[PDB]
């Protein structure tokens, strides 16, 4: 399969349209999912 099929390419050109503009972040950090905030207001015991 795959190589036994007519799978060949020499004209798969890159789309030059339909690109969604990607803005800048500057002040951003990927970080990590934090849901361990000890500032809920119930941390009294």
């Amino acid at each position: 399969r795959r190589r036994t099929e007519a799978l060949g390419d020499a004209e798969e050109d890159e789309d030059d349209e339909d690109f969604v503009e990607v803005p800048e972040k500057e002040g951003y950090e990927p970080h990590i999912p934090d849901h361990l905030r000890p500032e809920y207001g119930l941390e009294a015991a």
């Binding site: 789309d15 339909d18 690109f19 990607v22």
Partner: protein, 108 residues
């Protein structure tokens, strides 16, 4: 010059540039693309020469990135890596929006 590779922050594999398979490497101060197994980057743009970027959105048969320079120039990068196409795209995308303004400071 020519064969030069600074601190690579992002390494993306299988990236097609106008019917040419290669790899895209995000560097500390610039972005460069070179065909697979090549020491010389045929595409080299500093973040200071880029105005903004774009990405071929979901729905297209191929997920890609587009670098729009200051004069309206554009460099298209197709993530032909089926394994992490969308994933590497967003990685380059988010890191670009991160590193682009680091050098981009102009009114165009």
């Amino acid at each position: 010059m020519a064969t030069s590779s600074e601190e690579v922050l992002l390494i993306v594999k299988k990236v097609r540039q106008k019917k040419q398979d290669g790899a895209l490497y995000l560097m500390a101060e610039r972005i460069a693309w070179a065909p697979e197994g090549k020491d010389r980057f045929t595409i080299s743009h500093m973040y200071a020469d880029i105005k903004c970027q774009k990405i071929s959105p979901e729905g297209k048969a191929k997920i890609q990135l587009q670098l729009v320079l200051h004069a309206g120039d554009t460099t298209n990068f197709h993530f032909s890596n089926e394994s992490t196409a969308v994933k590497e795209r967003d990685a380059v995308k988010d890191l670009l929006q991160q590193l682009l303004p680091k050098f981009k400071r102009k009114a165009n």
